[PDB]
């Protein structure tokens, strides 16, 4: 088992994961648009 402090750190990460769930679904639009803008410069 890892040290006790380490397990406590995982709990802090879990809180962020809960919010990330809803954000991840919304995060799909920005990610798609960003990738496209870079590809155009590469083709040029």
């Amino acid at each position: 088992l890892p040290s006790l402090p380490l397990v406590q750190g995982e709990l802090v990460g879990g809180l962020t994961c809960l919010t990330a769930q809803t954000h991840s679904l919304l995060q799909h639009q920005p990610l798609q648009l960003t990738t496209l803008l870079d590809q155009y410069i590469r083709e040029q």
Partner: peptide, 29 residues
């Protein structure tokens, strides 16, 4: 996400700037 809750997310998207700021706080973390 069932339709009932998909609608709620759609409503959150079409929100006022002040309320969007409240939503942003959750998104920021």
């Amino acid at each position: 996400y069932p339709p009932k809750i998909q609608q709620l997310v759609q409503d959150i998207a079409s929100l006022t700037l002040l309320e969007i700021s409240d939503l942003n706080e959750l998104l920021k973390k």
